[PDB]
Amino acid sequence: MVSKGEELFTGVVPILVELDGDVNGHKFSVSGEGEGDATYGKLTLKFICTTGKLPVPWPTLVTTLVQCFARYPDHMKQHDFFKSAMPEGYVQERTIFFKDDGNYKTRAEVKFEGDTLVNRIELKGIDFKEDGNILGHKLEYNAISDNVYITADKQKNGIKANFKIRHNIEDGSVQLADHYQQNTPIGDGPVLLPDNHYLSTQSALSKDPNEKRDHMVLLEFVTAAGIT
Numbered sequence: 001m002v003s004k005g006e007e008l009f010t011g012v013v014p015i016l017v018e019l020d021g022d023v024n025g026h027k028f029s030v031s032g033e034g035e036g037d038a039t040y041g042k043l044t045l046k047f048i049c050t051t052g053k054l055p056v057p058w059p060t061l062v063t064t065l066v067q068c069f070a071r072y073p074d075h076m077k078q079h080d081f082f083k084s085a086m087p088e089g090y091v092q093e094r095t096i097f098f099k100d101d102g103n104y105k106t107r108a109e110v111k112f113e114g115d116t117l118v119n120r121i122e123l124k125g126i127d128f129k130e131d132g133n134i135l136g137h138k139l140e141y142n143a144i145s146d147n148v149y150i151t152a153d154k155q156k157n158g159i160k161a162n163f164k165i166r167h168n169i170e171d172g173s174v175q176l177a178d179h180y181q182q183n184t185p186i187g188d189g190p191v192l193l194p195d196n197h198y199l200s201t202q203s204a205l206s207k208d209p210n211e212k213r214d215h216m217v218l219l220e221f222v223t224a225a226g227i228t
């Protein structure tokens with residue numbers, strides 16, 4: 001048996017994302033739309049900065065901008081917290097430490113609004129260097145990929161995760177972003193508390209040749225692994 005929430009993901013699901021951000025006082029908003037097909041761990045999304053120019057690099061916002069779309073192998077379906085929390089949803093919180101630079105703190109609510117999966121986020125960044133790789137826009141517009149390591153957090157009826165993102169700098173070096181994550185259900189029903197495992201995630205970044213607004217197109221694959 002799969003969670004009741006998992007039943008909501010058997011087809012292609014529309015996705016909406018809304019983010020309000022403030023990084024060193026630079027305020028901005030992002031809207032996104034697309035679709036997810038969890039059977040294949042597959043997402044296609046387009047994001048637009050609705051306030052003008054984005055004041056940080058797009059790659060630094062990818063992880064913030066719906067892990068309920070992960071493909072869990074049949075043998076791992078009892079470990080999918082994210083879908084189990086649906087439709088009422090979950091809160092996803094992170095702190096993201098950019099090595100030798102500032103940090104993002106994020107709080108999001110991910111839930112269904114009818115048949116649409118919605119991710120609403122607030123992001124606050126502090127302590128960035130004005131001429132660092134973030135505020136100085138020194139990060140290449142490059143894919144990110146890595147493993148999200150998940151553990152249960154029984155005391156909050158949820159999960160924690162940690163991972164690293166190695167962003168390529170234009171000079172050939174690396175800007176590390178150390179992620180710390182916690183997710184807690186919004187509803188009061190039972191959820192699936194997992195054994196340790198990870199999400200293997202790959203995000204490909206591109207541009208819409210017809211789009212003049214500041215934007216990001218993503219094609220992403222997310223697959224659970226690490227058990228059997």
Ligand SMILES: [Mg+2]
Pocket residue numbers: none
């Ligand atoms: Mg301070």
